[PDB]
Amino acid sequence: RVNRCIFASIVSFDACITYKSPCSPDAYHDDGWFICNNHLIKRFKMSKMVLPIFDEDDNQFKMTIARHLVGNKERGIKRILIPSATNYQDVFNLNSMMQAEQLIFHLIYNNENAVNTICDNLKYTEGFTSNTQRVIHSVYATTKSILDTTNPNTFCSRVSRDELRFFDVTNARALRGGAGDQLFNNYSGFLQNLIRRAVAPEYLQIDTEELRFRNCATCIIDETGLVASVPDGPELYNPIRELDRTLSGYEEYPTYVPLFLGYQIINSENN
Amino acid sequence: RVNRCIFASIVSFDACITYKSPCSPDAYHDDGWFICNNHLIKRFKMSKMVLPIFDEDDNQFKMTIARHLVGNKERGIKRILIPSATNYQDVFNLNSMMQAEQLIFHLIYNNENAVNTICDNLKYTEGFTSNTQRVIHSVYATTKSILDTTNPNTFCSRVSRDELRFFDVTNARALRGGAGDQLFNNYSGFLQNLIRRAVAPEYLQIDTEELRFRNCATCIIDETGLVASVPDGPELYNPIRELDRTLSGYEEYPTYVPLFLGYQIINSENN
Amino acid sequence: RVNRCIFASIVSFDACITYKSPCSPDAYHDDGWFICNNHLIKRFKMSKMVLPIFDEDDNQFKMTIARHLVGNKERGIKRILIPSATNYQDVFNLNSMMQAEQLIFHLIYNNENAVNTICDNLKYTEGFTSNTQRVIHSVYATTKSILDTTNPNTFCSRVSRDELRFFDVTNARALRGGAGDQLFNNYSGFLQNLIRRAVAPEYLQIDTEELRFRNCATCIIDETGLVASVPDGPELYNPIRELDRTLSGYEEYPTYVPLFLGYQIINSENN
Amino acid sequence: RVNRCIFASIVSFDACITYKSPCSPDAYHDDGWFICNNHLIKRFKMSKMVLPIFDEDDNQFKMTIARHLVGNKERGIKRILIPSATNYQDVFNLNSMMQAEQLIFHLIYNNENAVNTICDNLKYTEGFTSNTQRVIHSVYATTKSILDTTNPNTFCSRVSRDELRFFDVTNARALRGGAGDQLFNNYSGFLQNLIRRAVAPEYLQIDTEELRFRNCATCIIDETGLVASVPDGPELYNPIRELDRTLSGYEEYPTYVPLFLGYQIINSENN
Amino acid sequence: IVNEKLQKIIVVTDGMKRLYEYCNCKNSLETLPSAANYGSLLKRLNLYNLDHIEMNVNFYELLFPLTLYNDNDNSDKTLSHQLVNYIFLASNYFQNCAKNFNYMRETFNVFGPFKQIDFMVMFVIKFNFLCDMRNFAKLIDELVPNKQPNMRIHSVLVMRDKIVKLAFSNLQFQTNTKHLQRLIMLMN
Amino acid sequence: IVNEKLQKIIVVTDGMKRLYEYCNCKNSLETLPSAANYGSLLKRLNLYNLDHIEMNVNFYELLFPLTLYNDNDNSDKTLSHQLVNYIFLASNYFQNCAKNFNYMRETFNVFGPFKQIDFMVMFVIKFNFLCDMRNFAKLIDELVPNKQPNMRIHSVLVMRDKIVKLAFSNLQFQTNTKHLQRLIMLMN
């Protein structure tokens, strides 16, 4: 009923030309994601989808899962989905998109200096005090309003130390698993929540049962941000009549790449 | 208009008691599979499904693929999907089904001794010469008229030696990767056709381009035949209100384990 | 009114199965060629076309010329347009075509041994003396009556300066460019006439003026006959909405590569 | 809707005699050429035309290509098509055409001094101030508007250095290949665009593929500008009853000489 | 004759091992280089130049000798698939080495600044692979000089060589005049 | 760094010429190798072991030394253009050679039946290339080790190198065990 996307409050505060808000209808839903699907796919190489987990008692359960949007021939920077604070401004060409988007990212990565620069450069424009200042207040306030829900600290910590989601079990060649896990901790509450809901666990631990869903991982985490690289192998293919006639709908099982990472441990009291 | 399942012509060669034929209409599709999915699922822990392959210019191409039906705690005998000719008689308790099914299995497994024993045993029984003689004659004629078409050789080999499928590209310190593909060359023509139609390659090589559809192997060929076992780790889980309501359909991405094993390359002239 | 194609007389001399006559209507024209365009494109990699030679006084003079029918990836025998005497049976695997086709090809290459073997083996078949004997007589007589006229005219050309056709490769260094002039001269009169009317020279000399059409060769003569391999380089390509909307009739300039090889001399008297 | 010929804005700014406009209707298309076909053939020995590129999937794509108008006996000066800044004023008899044409040419070669001389010489005529000055300003502005777009520098450079059209693989015996591509870059932007759109590469390089349209180059770049003379050989032919009747339309393969020089490399990124 | 290539590769490997390279061969081909196994090798190499090394690898030429060993008739299917598996393994190892060259460069230069760093890394790759190849040769049973080609094996080798050589090609670089004086004076 | 490879290649040219290879400089690279211009060279080389030669060539790496060269600032476009024409010429030469090994095999076999004719042709091609590079190096003025590269030349080299590698990879071909026993004894 109410929009719940970070980019929903994006505005072109010129007082003459309006802005765009192509956030998908799911933007209003309280799915736990805080980015509308349109802006999520456009700004990031992510695709919201649903992962259903069943049991032997015919119990339905679905958990948040994202999807790749990157091809194969792409190398290096393009393979990086969510860059880190030290490697996002370069890859996100802040001076290209509208100032409000830039400020959104700056808050995302704790880039207060860029917020100050955006404000002081905005002061220079004519007609600024008329409505530009009020709109910068509106956009900044709504963005912070999303941030607080995302951030775990806030004022009162509503944190439940139940889900042991450590975001690595990889059996990597180099003994740096404690380092890949050491990361993801510098990310803001928004970043940690977004990466948590985007990637679904491959190994899940509830009570005593050990769950496994993929024989091998999907992506990997580096200090340069969230990067999608299968360990030790080629990149997985991305798609982006008579045989079709003779082959009917047979549970197509589309092969669009799902995300997979991390070890999940769930306590008995957890829900 | 005519069923194309080997088991679709199962006949109770007694001339008194009628026989069953639970083949679904799917067997009428000439997709390359010669078993109605009912008989395939009943005898084997597999299910027909097709994965379509796309491109960059919106061109369609689809290829068949199988799907596991074994559980997790299920170990050993039940874990086998396609047992070898050495270990097929025990796993399929030939003393359980009708003798016609045993004849079909033996012909598929090229067990000529069993066929001769069943024929000369059927010679003795009273009233066999009346109708059962020609009944078994027609059954055997149909079985061979399928078997020959399955085999590449026939009277003259109508083989299309263009698609090169190895079926064993794995490397998990087996030290005998050269042993993993020992079989699949001893199988009968129909067995090889069915197994190839069932499992799809994780790596595909079209001339100069490399494609990848999986991170790690799914099944493996064992000396006791094909087994629905994922190497290098514990078996993946097999599944056999408020949250669902607030999370509508978002491309469930079905989780039942598909088939992925082996390596494929296409020659220049192949189309 | 009367067709002048050697293959126009192709007939299945079995008296039971009908024969095909795909020769195009143009084969009735006495333009100098002796093959119907359909047979020319079928048996050989040739396609009849004409080239007009004008001047500054707007005078008409046209000469015969041929065109490629090979792609790029084809190699070996596929690159051969007209095989030599030794290497024609293998490239044409005469055992696979109709017996009358084999007889005609043997007559073209003057393979008297093959003709005698086909005749004395055809003596053995039943019903031969009834009608197959007269059919073979008619076919042989027509083939002789087509071949005969060519040998004098080819011979007279090989006598005197009237038109000095030199297959010498331009830029003598060039490539292999073998002076197969007598390999051509080792061809039968029909083959020599066909190749002369198929390929045109790059330099032409009328009276005293010099005319040039191509800067380099197109085909080349080798021991395996005339092969469409451009000397000293990869072979040329063979092709076999908005921007299209803005591109109107703009002198399409056909991109297919026609034959160009050899040197010609014209005396004042020729017409 | 708007004509895009450089000389289409020709004005006989005498204030007495009107100017003509013989440009062909097709000049209004968005071809990218800035010269109408009539101007193309008048001011240069060039004729626009198109070459199509097909494929095995029946795709359409094509590019512009020029045609010669120079004959055979023409030598030296007549063989120059697009001279450099060193040798254009002499070859284009600047004292023969309209003053506006002279100004256009001086602009084309960045001949600013001739521009100033023609302007201040015209200033002395009576009645100039009325409308001749405004007409000269209009002509200069039109010329600059045509010129700026093709330039790589411009005001906001929309540079896309993805087309590697290097313009020289001639196997020139003299080891001085370092002159062809050495020129064609010291020229005006309009000259560079015109020559790029006029001549199509004989060898095509896209990603991993290699194509060949002409086995040997046709034109060549020289200090005196582009010259339509294949190196080391006589120039190519240029043409500017019963036998014809029986020789009907047989794909005449027009004999006019197109342009062919240089190599094209295209990366995957470029459109 | 192909047997020339057989004996040539055999003797080259033997002599190259004999001269300087001591077999440190326990590790297999299913892994990337490990620093602990090669520190002393790098230290000793530091004083001997390796610029002779060619970045590219003659994959098909390297693996051709072991194509032609087979007892007459179809003695056993095991050799065919064993060879195919070995080929795929070496291909993927080379691909991963080319793909992740920077990390290995850093991991090996952390122990010292050398001027042959990437040279030494490529030498280590080739030497370890060649030791694994020598072990695999010790695994095989017998050969023949009849020189019977195999279309399947050759096709696999050709495709893998194309892929591997292209991947090696994609390797690129980040984008004392008296030496040239001496060179020119030598040329004249 | 780059200066290492540059000096190494220069010294390799000098030493390889000093030992065996000699100037037959009348022939340039514009056309195919001329057996008539190499009969003496072939006869000389026929009495040596050439089995160390291999069908591939590191064209990209081979021309990489010449890449790093310039005077202060862009004095003129002569250097880059000269190099570009050289590169395209080399690419065409190598591709034509690879496409026409049958012609050269026949021509060099006519002079006499020699076992190592393949390696002979390969070394002929390489030697012609090396002499042409020697001349073009004689043309140039100065080099620096600052390793400031050019993007365009780099891309052209990469692409033409991919073509060359694929072209040579097109090479396929159809059709003493006591030495195998000796090897097995040596390893054990």
Author numbering:
A (entry chain Y), B (entry chain Z), C (entry chain X), D (entry chain W): 14 to 253, 279 to 309
E (entry chain A), F (entry chain B): 490 to 664, 673 to 685
What's the publication's text?
Baculovirus Autographa californica multiple nucleopolyhedrovirus (AcMNPV) has been widely used as a bioinsecticide and a protein expression vector. The DNA genome, along with the baculovirus basic DNA-binding protein P6.9 protein, is encapsulated by an enveloped, rod-shaped nucleocapsid; the major capsid protein VP39 and some additional minor proteins are known to comprise the nucleocapsid. Here, we show a 3.2 Å resolution structure of helical cylindrical body of the AcMNPV nucleocapsid, composed of VP39, as well as 4.3 Å resolution structures of both the head and the base of the nucleocapsid composed of over 100 protein subunits. Surprisingly, the C14 symmetric base had nearly identical features to that of the apical head, except for that in the central regions. Both the head and base could be further segmented into three parts: an outer shell, an inner layer and a central region.
At both ends of the nucleocapsid, the VP39 cylinder is constricted by an outer shell ring composed of proteins AC104, AC142 and AC109. Along the helical cylinder at the base (or head), three AC104 (VP80) subunits bind to the outer surface of VP39 at the end of the helical cylinder. AC109 sits adjacent to AC104-3 on the end of the VP39 helical cylinder and sterically blocks the elongation of the cylinder. AC109 appears to alter the conformation of the Thr163-Glu176 loop, elongating the “spine helix” in P-domain of VP39s at the terminal layer of the cylinder at both ends. This results in the formation of a disulfide bond between Cys169 of VP39 and Cys187 of AC109. Additionally, AC142 extensively interacts with a neighboring AC109 through a number of hydrogen bonds and salt bridges. These interactions result in fourteen AC109-AC142 hetero-dimers forming a “barrel-hoop” like structure, which tightens and constricts the capsid cylinder from 500 Å to ~400 Å in diameter. The inner layer of both the head and base is composed of AC101 and AC144 arranged with C14 symmetry. Interestingly, residues Leu243-His334 from each AC101, which is comprised of four helices and connecting loops, form a ring-like structure that encircles both AC144s in the inner layer. AC98 (38 K) is only found in the base as no discernable density corresponding to it can be found in the head. The N-terminal domain of AC98 interacts with VP39 and AC144, while also associating with genomic dsDNA. The interactions between AC101-2 and AC109 essentially bind the inner layer to the outer shell at both ends of the capsid.
